[model samples]
Target: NNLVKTEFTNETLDKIQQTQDLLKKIPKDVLEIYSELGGEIYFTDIDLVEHKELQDLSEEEKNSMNSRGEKVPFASRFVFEKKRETPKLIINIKDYAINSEQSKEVYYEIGKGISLDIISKDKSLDPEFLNLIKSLSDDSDSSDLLFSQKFKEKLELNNKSIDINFIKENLTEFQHAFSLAFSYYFAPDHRTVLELYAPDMFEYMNKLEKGGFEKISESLKKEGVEKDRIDVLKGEKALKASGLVPEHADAFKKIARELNTYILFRPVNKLATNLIKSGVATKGLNVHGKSSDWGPVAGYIPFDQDLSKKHGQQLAVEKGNLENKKSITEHEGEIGKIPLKLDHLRIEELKENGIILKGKKEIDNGKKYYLLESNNQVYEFRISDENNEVQYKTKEGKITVLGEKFNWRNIEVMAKNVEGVLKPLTADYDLFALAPSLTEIKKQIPQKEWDKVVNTPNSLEKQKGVTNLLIKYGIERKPDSTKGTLSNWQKQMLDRLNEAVKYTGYTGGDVVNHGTEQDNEEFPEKDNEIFIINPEGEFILTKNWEMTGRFIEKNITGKDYLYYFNRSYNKIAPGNKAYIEWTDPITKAKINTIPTSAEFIKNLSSIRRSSNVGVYKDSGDKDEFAKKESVKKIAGYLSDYYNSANHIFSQEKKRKISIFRGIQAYNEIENVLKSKQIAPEYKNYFQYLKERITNQVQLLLTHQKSNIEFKLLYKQLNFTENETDNFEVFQKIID
Candidate 1:
């Protein structure tokens, strides 16, 4: 009753198992000696967890402090090493299941554990161990009590010993000094025990989806929380104190000399509690909420020459930086707040690179531009009218838009000097600003999304897509970098840029291949819509494919396989098929029944600014534009599907209104797409189309050019399919 009895967590049970493990490890002679006597060496199951003041703090006090709206300061850490098949680094030292948001600068988590009371009360030590010590020595004033050989055997037979010094050099390290009686017993059943539980740091680096924990670790590093480690915790020295820092006294040494066991106590937790109580811990728990695991005494610490202040300063810089990121990045319906179109996933990487979302504005007739800033250098991206040709405003801020084809090389190698550099929306996008339309995307992205990217619980896996619409123009994706096909224009563009700078190590030419065939001179589709390609640069979608150039039609009389040209001319590869059948998008029936001719009109004498806008009467010039509108409807439906599919806001609603206002992806769950909108015959077509594209995009990965092009081309082609799908609903009621 006077001593503590305690590993399955039944400290006594666990230690007994440890005691039995030493049977084969020790020499037979040692075991015989132990059998003749009665002691076994043992492993300590738990380190002493002694902090009287902290342990004594009542639950009432803790509850009272929390109830008053004041945060109770706490610490957090991963447990020492692996044990019990620990699946992850489970911690609740800070009273929160995850302390990801907690700042390392805050003193609460610095100490790892509070200051402990290491004093071992003599009264609690075994009366037998104490008596054994007395019997081994003579009454000091007298000489040595040299025992005879026969008496030594008698002592051994009686489970006692006079040459206790003999055991000192022979026992194993597992023979712990935690307790004199528990460690020196040869009766394996009574030799070892302790009571405590903690998980390991092994899983801290491993994640199912895998991004969550790496981000957490990086977050702590910036805050300077680097001291927590299992090996580092042993006390610095055996120094005495007036009931504070207890030194290992003479009795502790005597037992170790005779028993050859060790109990190097760790003092991290002990110091933490002292720091907190003494007001040395300046910050409270930065991570809010109740910790799922109530670990014993975690937290207090060293004030090292005011370095604590340096940590505070480092934290403040990131504070303003985060506030700026969150500040400049937001949405506004009525414009009370600053508008931003920032991706939450890149916030961590972006802020570190000095990038901030400046907002969005309209130029010309509602041409939208999303702004980004880095080091006071501003850049903007403009979504194009023809669609694939996105225009980028260079750093010079040219007011009158004489928009040329935007390429990264153009910006980097302009005829006239452009002052600033183009920065990516996130580090994920190295040089290209794969920009998305912020207008279509709400500026005030609900914090639900903001929080999701940073802390979408570890248990979450798949079932959604996080897609991005990269800026199309001003983006000549780095050559030799990805698995892609380049057009000749793209190559020539890179060729010029390469002359100025050896970007991509200038290793290969603009015409590069990644595991697939490469020939930029190959003629692509003239269907008037950019294509989407898989990683191998192979066409992912066969419908409505187009590129950025024109086709030069020619006629040959005999035409003996007329693809090859003479020498240099033949070197430029022509694509497999020149013309494809104009098939109905939904029905897939070949509707191409005519040699559609272009009515020749007088061409512009020379390029002029005013010549940019004009109207060609397609209604009379081309008779079949209306038939194309049907599948144009398909693109509208698929685009809406893309938006709804990419969202991972929550499971609160399985399906809801899409970002697009006119479709059922936004209205499907409630029959909101009135029969008039989708028409009865095509109603089921919506589900089939969603599932169809969803299947392809899901496997291809929504972020790939194949996926983006699948949705983007259709979204554009549903109307611009070779410019043949251009149709009007009404002629302004007979204007």
Candidate 2:
């Protein structure tokens, strides 16, 4: 069976039958084969079977099998053996790179900062490492080459740290090698540059925009540039206008160009573009002062071609809108056939292909009709007060009446029905038409309630009900196909509602179908997923996937709704007790981070909610100092609210709720400051300790204004029921 392909023939079967005594010696399960093998079968080797201790077979079987063994095949022994253990293979990246006969330059370049000698030596590594080497060898200048090199080096380091020490030790050499490797893989013609002064370019732009270029501004005005012209100028334009600004612009431009080249070479352009778009990069670049007065053009120039084109188009549209004064109505009829008027039957030039009614004729019973003419055929509609009918040419070229006759009032009735349908709905007929097709709109809501909701006093009050109805029936808002007439808020709200119900952000191609338990599976190192410590307290999936977060944040108003359902941890409430739990999908390990401070949550909630997205961090660096500072600022704000007893109590319920939340937050702050677990530096700070004093003062002041109790507590804080109304004196005492 091992010498040749196993075949079951009549000869073999006959041999087996002849050796029945030997076959009987084999066990049923051990002998897997049958008379005429149709599937796999097993048996002992012919020699082993012939020598077996069957009293009669030893002598008879040996003699019979030995004679026929050369020509006829015998079943071989199929030994059931245990599964083999996987062989552990290890190799040093440096050794492989240095010894690789094909490409020594690639390895040498990659080995500069990263100690390739130490990699994959401690434990068995995947054989795919060889494939990665071959890939770099195959395409020396790949797009991902630089990124892969940097990533590998970072992975080998502790914490993937990118601090100044890391930069000083490795950045220079890494940049050179990375730039070289990137060239071989992609953009062979692109030049390499270091991002050394990239940080300075931002500072220059900020200074120029914020009165640092006042002398240049005056120079430009003297040179006949308009005062307002300077406001619109940006980038190279602003740099060249004052010719006097050249030295500064030249110095800055060098940095900008170098940084742009470095980004392209490093291929961090995508991340850089996103950061710029989100104002993350631009914010850091602002060295002069934080000011919203500067236009978007004043920010760092985009290295991306697409981003540049997008900016150009936006600017062009803005300029055209400001400069062009033509009425929209004049341009409306330029594209398609002009709508025909029903009241007039006057003939006009046949400039475009369309149907036209040429002549109107009055008939009996107060009926009127018109002759319809087109390029293909001519027809006539005969109308009466009761019914309307059309006459058209048949294939035989003879005039004939159409079989169907619509009610005379069909057009008028349908128009009235549409208006009636829209009258009570929150949406106008035009706006509802803008939502989706009539079929979809009708499916979302029948005629009954549309009119009622439209006439409701508050239009947006019914937004949720309408949004739910549309989404329930799979009706999505179609893109607006009208001229620029709808308000920006309307368009934004419409898009937001459509995306929210559909759960657009929840699923993507990167989502793993299986959990992290696949044996020996390797997780990808880089990802752009928005992971959140979702409201459900499960850290496995994003909050958007839960559906509840979307509705609670998007549909409902106010921060109170966030805490309405349960007692939730407030990041800014104080102390490091509040933390968000996250689970590592790759390692299946649980990680936690302190909740971001109150202002961080507040800003993110407001901005992200308005944008119909959630912005949050994953489990990583928890900035305790920043949180402490934010908490301190919030303590003061809460103290202000606590002190303003006169205005806060205008509504009893509102006042009580405010006071309760305020006191709760204040107590938390006090506890955090007094806790021994907090750093002594933070504890010893005079400003930090003053918060508790202020809290007490505010509480006493509130009680004193209302003539409430806690008289002994007030006196302890050095208040003597003083009726002094001098605001400055009271403010000084409180401070």
Candidate 3:
């Protein structure tokens, strides 16, 4: 059976035969033969590719510019098109030379780190005295080599851990290796650069445009060259102008090159090209204390690329609208001209010829219709008036159609009537013309409609999360038929016109290392470099998959697979995301973190605190100090909603409803206890505790509903009614 290509043939044949028997319809012998031959009897691996334009609602009828001519279709009432970004894969290495140096170190350090964890997992080596081999790879000029020869020598001690004393004794080697590795991997790239100077520089540049340089504005002067000396910043142009001595020539050229790349408020004479880059300057211009108008300087510089990126993105929605309206179907050939079979229209195996679809035409009543007639004729019609009435005569009788109609009967009657009257007239008229096409303008209604809900702060947080999701998982497009257009959603957001839903902050491909073509056949890594935007708006470089496994093993454990899975695959796991839940210390909710997927391992991890609390540590670090620090941090921010309130709302409705119910319950129970007759002894602490329990019960109820809803939404649109019917009994126990 394993070797046979059609091993499931017998079962499939039986199923197919049974299906036809109960329905009492036999398929043609060819179909039966194909089934017996173990070919696919039903759709198996067919694909549907949908790329639509943002619809145009204002247009009454869209005139589609197709291959043949114009196609007119009625406007779409509601547009439900999603503008998916094209899959853009870029491995943006900062300073190719430095990136090459850094990568080798990261790889080596991670391998060593993993080896240590592996030793802990299986202590085949000396646990107390694992040898550390430290080498000077990054410091040396030969840092660009495939691997440090000395680093690989420590493979014997790989996966082994050393005690503190052992580490201390050989601290030099460990420190050297660890430091080099740490510096190599965790060193800042674009983010750090931006952090250090980009804001200041950007501000300075804007000021320079408005008022021509800031540092030189009043009396801030550190001058090497006076105004008379040819500006050194304009490299080739200044070189020709200066005609300085050779020694000064190299210095000036170097200065010019640096100035050009520095991207700040450079001296006007030195950076004359850039000052006039937007077309403002011709000769001597002011550097600081404006001797001339700043308008000229500003005019020379083109508008910021970011400024127009919004409009460029808006166009995508427009292109997408046209794509959505098309419904593709295949027929053997012209309906009546050729024998009907799916094979005749097959794209391939048309060994002799190809096929194409031409535009269809309409004929008016009593018009001289062209009679290039074949045995069977195909025609199409439309409603001539608002009521859509048609009048015709049959040999048996006369007929007048009303509002509600059926074409099958009309066609049968017409065929019979025509046959009886004209002896050999056979005709079929297609009632509906081509399906009305949708344009990009039509795609905006749903997105615009949803924006009203999404604008709320609670819903806004979910929208941000969704944006992240789209960037990560949405099918992105590349320049296809229509190259310039913002996707419809982007157009709605306006700010996000050309930007990615979530910027991964890394690019891939063709990384030429240190000018060595041989070293760069293809980029070494293909894995997407994901990023984490921290609370401080700092874009942190996260460990890639292989490094991640090692990081967990060193900082956590081989047994801590949950930690591994959570950090690496959190996007797929909804539970990993943080939300509020019931807590004990205060009357309100607390913040909590869930256990990692590794929690699934036997007794390794579990939700330490119940889901009722907000974000809390799932597992204490093996180290006491670390664990205490974690607990303290979680305690401070737990339920401090106003400050960190971005993710307060539920993304899925079932989850939201569940939480809402809890809120309602807590309010209800607390309100009832306000009466003095409830007992003074129990009023404060007892009632508070009762409310906490109620809150927890609500959380659990909501959590269950969320799980059920996620599954139900995938199946059908009736989840609300269906779940309510089946699980209304559960809802009855609420406060």
Candidate 4:
């Protein structure tokens, strides 16, 4: 009430109340609204009318012409600044004080009163205040007067009239333009706005503006449009065109089919546009120093609908692959790095013994291929013409052998023809190469016969098929093979054997005398385990031989029903023979590993290499093994060193300047035109600006995409941490 002595009259108080009446919650699409209207937003400005001091050079500033030749108005300069700033068009509103109905509590704004402040900020050289001749020269010559806030002598004026209806009519355009400006300034917020108002705007912009433009240009050329017209078609008229029979909706969607097509293409463009408005692109704080909200996304737009659907389905199929475990111990310290080796179990139980089955079909017999092994050497085997036999090479030459008579050993020997045949003396050496795990030949003997076999042992563990099986399946040996064999071993072997007599159990004595009595003594019990001598003179495990729990059978059906395709095999058959080799990148040591596990294979164009890269430069010592400490030490140190160097190099090479100028431009334009009483003709310009600004956003998003940091942070709170006492500490870091 009293700085230099001021008082609020009834009239002044009413203005404040009117300003309050117009205020509401800011629209969520504030930025888009700004761009659509105009960059120059209207704001309240208050200033002095006449000055007591300073000279006014008014004579020279006077316009001599009539209304037709007179100036439009210098106050527009202030409007430009207001538009650029998109300032909060604020007015101090005072609540109405009354007990009556309509007048109980209402707010009013000093609308016309604000225009007084525009003059000083305007670019024009005209002075806002009149000179006080009583203190200075008593003539019209001194007129370049300037003063702040208010003057002692209030200047008399015939108030310029404003048509309320006209202002109200243009309110929509003004509000829309302002919203656009706000959206451009805050990119992520803009995305949120689009999510609310134009829910599919981002996607639409991508499909129509970015993607459709290219497509339309191509289509125009295809339709034989002139070269110059084609440029205009894509450039200016692309979004404006009526697409193939109501296919077009707007700049983004022009046709009915184009509406659908918009979703089909230009994903990057949409993302970029979103990024610009959200401040998620090359980010920086606001002019007022608040953090910007623009940056990268964790994942890119999945192009294929089927793939996206499959990913969703997969998540629901098994409740996702991430299996988090809860701790059972009372002391919940953070869990240390304890490796759980599931690979051994997977390879043995799930893969070997052919238990992990994959579905097979008789589709295009020509596509069927097999791996044949003989004498431990493996080679490719093609399906026979009738699909009844395997055709492959032997030491002598190419041979087509029937499938029925072939066993694992014979097949393995035949498969090794790609390598030359070797004599028995040299065969041992080749066998070592063929089956690296085979160190000794060990045979499966009944507990009772174990002592006997030990007394007269074979040459190596692999001499008997049992050792190869043990190496393949990581099961411990048992002292007995009686009921276990009968229930488990016999059941599995019999079922897997050729579709002949399906045996399910084994009795200690000959069945010939039991059911249909005969004189034949075909089956016998050896060391309490039943054995069935086939008609071909081969002794096989029977039901009454071993404990059921001691043996496991491969799941023949489940694997058959579901299996990941052998991607490598697909490439090999396609005649791709390139074999690029490299040592272990981390340890710089050569070791054989799966193509997927080795980084080099993934970097190649063909994941399914016909011939794989060979390992080299390994010391051939246990200490240098990938599992050994020496190898791990070297790998860890070198990996860290190399990666650090690479990171630094990239940082040094990158551009340092911020890349958001285009985005800023659109936002500025949006605010100016949107927040005032702009005309109807200019209203569509707001729409054009909106389209253009969003297009810019789409472009920006591509460069700003990144979610790796979030993911890494998420990883810091690993599922395994709760297993230890330091769980709280780990959680603290996560938070």
Candidate 5:
């Protein structure tokens, strides 16, 4: 399995399988050369991307122009390899869907970079290498041969050549090697002299266009070089006009173009080209971007190519307004003559083919019609408008009419009903994208401030201790601040220092990190990721995978126990995102964060409700310093509502009718409490409620009991008839 070729998901994917099958058998010696030379030969029919564009819009369709064709196996070589992390030869056929020119260019660059890198390592090839570098020189002085002797240990007779044989043997190959070397050598000088000499070319290229350089601008458009890359061509043209080098670097590229047809490329290029021309490979099929990645991988093949004869291949390349109508399926007059396999169509594969910018199913009359997209053509497929019609006459017709369609609209709802799986309800966002680096931070604060900030022990006092430092040193105070104290600028600037501090602050007692558990899974060494700005000011880099349904938090508290449900999604452990068990504090009864949403909580724990009265740390800490204050502020509000609830329930009904009237009174109290807050009494009734409720709970909680005893016990307790049901609420409070 390791040696077997990798599989792909594109419609034209199999073409690559056969191509890889042949490449694996590349003369074993060639593989050895690659290993030693440190480069990879990659042939891709898909887009080689990281390059970006093409965001779809809804208001109107986009028209095309002045664009560099998509870069697929757009042939190029990575000449700037240092540690040799990237591939050497990149053949992108995606530019024109798959073209011979780019395929051949792939081998040409392979030949050039490979040959150049090889000779650069082996010193013996020095004279042979420079002999070609000599072609562009005006004078071959003794200066050129100064190293020729050291290269030969002295060569008076080394000028000897075998006439036609030497010239013929090396002309084209040497010429080809010189092309890459020329660009490799001259691109630097172009940047150098232009930076110093010519002024206008550099200026216009960097800015907008408005002159004779319009020709240069048009030249760049064919290659889709926008202003930035266009500036490069402008610089090169200026260098050409300066007549510094013999000709532009492209001249050599053109001269040596066919040189790749020589040795190694001969067999490889021949077979690859043959398969492509005969439509036996990718050119005949649809190539999409999904498995490895997508966005720019799709494109249409040119009609002139032998490969575009296939049904979808033509439309994939040049699909016009054929998809404007809601159902554009049956327009395949000439196309319906040839059969296309349903197996070849992967529904979602039509995202984009570097060509057309391009859903819905509606039932009408007796037929179930579906909108389908395949091969870049839109089709309105129906299961027959006639009731008695069983199915489509053909398999292709059947699949089109009743095949699976990617319903992107209702996907979220459909996903939620699955038994045990979590689905993405929306896009995931984080503070991490485009996060600033330590160097970027270094521009603002002194390293000394951060050293003290991130290095100190995690303590409450230390928080204020460091914040004052952030105020003092993080954004250096205005030199003339003696006049008006902390003007708007100072506070606004002060906020930035604190923000920066949070990103790098200490958390765990002394450890310089804090985040969700996974954020700090690793200790000081950080096994996975932990971003804490250190004493050295070294801000290292590391996405949170969480479906946090909603964040649950603070505000108005009362009824002792409110349920906790995990509106869950799991990166690993389940966590609730945005569901709550209580009403909004500010909004009051207008909206409830936690509503009648279904089952599942981490087994109901009344947290926020118990926080204010609990005689402990977080009890008061839920507010900044609220232990006593947390109780006092709410105590006043609950005290007011306490009397209101007590008055209604306090009326003791006649004994015989008290059972029904007590429930009726309890119901009235419930309604009155519903319109207002149902909270503790003025004197912390919660204090006595727990003890009194628990004392009775111990007696009634015998595994078995009768309603006779249940009712009799409440007779002695303070709770009257209907209120006795709340004894069960207290019963719910125990372990």
Candidate 6:
């Protein structure tokens, strides 16, 4: 009666018999390793037998136990047995039975009991014999007719239809069908079974409906199943079994790809579109024992694909540079409302300090406001909705003005006749001041406008663009060299003066008069302030005074002049005189007899300066020379010593030695410059040389130090062969 009420009906016996037959067909070796810890079974007409080799207990005792086996004390009969079933091969098995509310539980000893564990799990069946009972019930003629008639009536009454043809055509849909059947058989919730068996596919289904996958594999694994490994493969198999063509295969593969990606990238909970903003990591998980079955981790998810496809292009454009929100919100009528015009606005038009204007239209009733965006913040203004009267409110609430008070300086004005009301407004523009290049100017504006820009007087007071153009056209005048045709020196002088305005930073046209003496009759008197072009010239005052021009002319003698200026020589002001004085070439004796008078200044102008050449003269205190020469010798030997000491010196000691050498050289030069005997003008000259030599030595030391430090850190990281390479490859796989 108990068996008939539940799974153990007549139909189940046939299933058991069928399973028993099929169990024999399975390979014996495969079954040899399978074991069930505890399983239920039922049998009848069995007896407990006593051992025959119990000599300690008399034969009479053994016979008493056997003869009284059904009646004698069960405990005594167990103790009398000194021998158990054994043959050429001995296999262990145990048998026991216990009564319960149902048919009761029983354990049977069938030598090396046939294992049904793997088959049971594969069939996804319960330990109960109900499946066996149902199959047996279906095999009997009377019960089969009864079951068929009863099942038909139940289906008809419930208004549910079952179609085999539809399920055959759609193999993928059988995922849900099998899952529902499993739930029914196991007495578990349908959702629980679905999650356990088809976690990846369930998440994929949610994706098609525009929902997040939300790491379902994680939850399934928490339920103690290898969900990621099994479900991903199961989902793929279903996709293939659906008979999709190659052309239509991409959509299914995309679904499977995302399912596997969800399995792989479940460590971070974020959409691909939010990757740049969230900075969340897409971490990996274990691939179970069957690593090869999972395939490559790439193409599983939408990794780098556009995930915000449904948000529309316009919405994406508006949200492109947003810092506060990922997407625009539909207004919910919150406090401090801003009334927007019906027309759409672009992101560029809402740039900081940008302006826009809207024409008056049919006035709507109640408070109307406009939303003006600036500096990533939205400002709101409420205006009267009657008679098209426009009032602008100041940020401080101190000034309130009508539309007539608006001007180009405060608020940009665009006439509807010039451009439609939608035309973008700019702050200000200059025809000549904003030129980047001649080509850029021509590309931006017309040629006629470019003419005005080039010819406009006092256009670029800081003339970088003009200077670059002059150089490009090969029209920039050279120092002390005049080649261009001009009627008079005044014309040439005026033209150069105009070009001089292009000078800024380190560039300008050359002023020939500053570097060389010219006849007063050949040039205009106003040409005193002019550009003096050096090889690499910039806009700088070169002719402020007689001494200033002479100082510049003297420095331009060599290419090292600019290099020296950049490296500390620029500290000396342009107006500083050369401060030349006569000295004995060998004894360094000062010629103090020189006159300092107005006539002496005139005589100084007539004296032509000569380049120092042909003599090696010492012009300083003996102690200072010794100091410089000592450091110079140390520096000269250090390079050779560094190479030779590689085998002798420790890294720490070598670094200390190099640093000490650099510092010693630097300090000795400084002491010479600060000495009381050194002239102020000569100090600048000596300082320039010290800096040049010290900078070069310092660079070499730094290079060697970095090389050693890199080697040390590389060893510290302890990278094995191909470890970093594998890491890079893995990163690309996830990305």
- Highest lDDT scorer: 2
TM-score of every prediction relative to native: 0.16, 0.16, 0.14, 0.15, 0.18, 0.17
lDDT of 4 by residue, 1-735 (tens): 110111233446354444333223122122122222222222232312112111123322342221111243532211111222322222222344322432212111111112111211110112211211111111123342321111112211113121332223433222222223222222322344433433232333234334432443344334443432211122223221211111111211222121111111101222222222221111101000111111111111111111112232434312211211111021123210111111222223322433222233333435443332222122222222233233333323322122112222211100011123210000000000001011211232344444443454555532444443442331222222321112122222222221121132221111111110010012211121222221222222223212210110111112111111112221222233422121213333222111111232233213224234211124575423432332233233223322333434443121111112222233333443444433333345434534544443343333444322322423353333253533443334323
* Model 2: per-residue Cα lDDT over 1-735, one tens digit each: 221112222244443442343223322211221111111222222322223222122112232211101222223321111111211111111111222242323322222112211111111122223222322221233332233333353334434434333433543333333323322222212112212212222232233334523433244335443432212223444222222112322322343232111000001222122221121221111011111101111122211111122333444434333221221223322211111122211123221212233445656455565443433321222323233333232233422122222222211100001212210000010111111222433444665666566666766657866655545432322223332223222344233322332242311111111111111012211111112111221111112212333322332212221111111211221233333222223223111111223533464456455554333223243544444554555555454444545553555434443443344344445545544344343444323334444444345447435443323323333223542433234333333
- Candidate 5 lDDT over 495-597, as tens digits, reads 3432332333311111101112212112211112212211222222110111111111110012111112111211222232222232234435222111111
Residue-level lDDT of model 3, residues 158-238, one tens digit each, is 344444434445433443333233223233322233223223322322332343322222211223234333222333343
Ranking by lDDT: 2, 5, 6, 3, 1, 4
> Which candidate should be chosen as best, given TM-score against the real structure?
5
Off by over 4 Å in 6: 1-735
Off by over 4 Å in 3: 1-402, 405-689, 693-735
Clash number for each model: 35, 17, 49, 129, 20, 26
lDDT accuracy of residue 297 in candidate 3: 14
Candidate 2: residue 329 Cα off by (Å) = 52
Residue 689 displacement in candidate 1 (angstroms): 9.7
Which runs of model 2 end up more than 4 angstroms from their true locations? 1-230, 234-664, 675-677, 681-735
TM-score for predicted model 5 compared with the true structure: 0.18
Model 3 reaches what TM-score against the true structure?
A: 0.14
Cand. 6 Cα-lDDT: 0.26
lDDT of 1: 0.24
Using lDDT as the yardstick, the better of models 1 and 4 is 1
Candidate 1 residue lDDT tens string, 478-509: 33433344322333322333232223232112
The lDDT values for all models are 0.24, 0.28, 0.25, 0.23, 0.27, 0.26
